[PDB]
Design a protein around this ligand. Sequence first.
Ligand SMILES: [Ca+2]
Ligand SMILES: [Ca+2]
Ligand SMILES: [Ca+2]
Ligand SMILES: [Zn+2]
Length: 168
Amino acid sequence: FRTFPGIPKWRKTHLTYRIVNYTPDLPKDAVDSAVEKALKVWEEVTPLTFSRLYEGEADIMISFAVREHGDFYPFDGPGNVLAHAYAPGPGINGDAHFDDDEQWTKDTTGTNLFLVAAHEIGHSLGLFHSANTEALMYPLYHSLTDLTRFRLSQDDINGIQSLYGPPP
Ligand SMILES: [Ca+2]
Ligand SMILES: [Ca+2]
Ligand SMILES: [Ca+2]
Ligand SMILES: [Zn+2]
């Protein structure tokens, strides 16, 4: 596993999130279930806890975006870059953007929203890319991960725990 340099990490245990907008590709309920499951992946193995906000500035603002979207890192149309996310910190840091030129899905028929969300949230919590090929944080996770038996690898757990420790 790896971290960003200077090891940016959140300095509190309870984090807020907010779903700013919704993709046309899926029912709203599926977008929400997907983010929730992505958050629980990491919640499950640390002392971190999360709550949802509906107005205001949450730590981790989640949005769907195409091409230029008001940061310096435009999306690239279909495939390739699926989503990007900033390391822990104030403002845009911690936030996660999802390229709506992908077809987001709840199964494996398009780009699976849960899988990319969990990987992106990895980044929002302070994990950089893993050299381990079965880790969620391995940059090709998207092609290499089986869905019905999903299991955070030990490399991911070792990584997020080095930052926040194990759960209470
Ligand atoms: Ca933020
Ligand atoms: Ca793309
Ligand atoms: Ca789309
Ligand atoms: Zn962006």
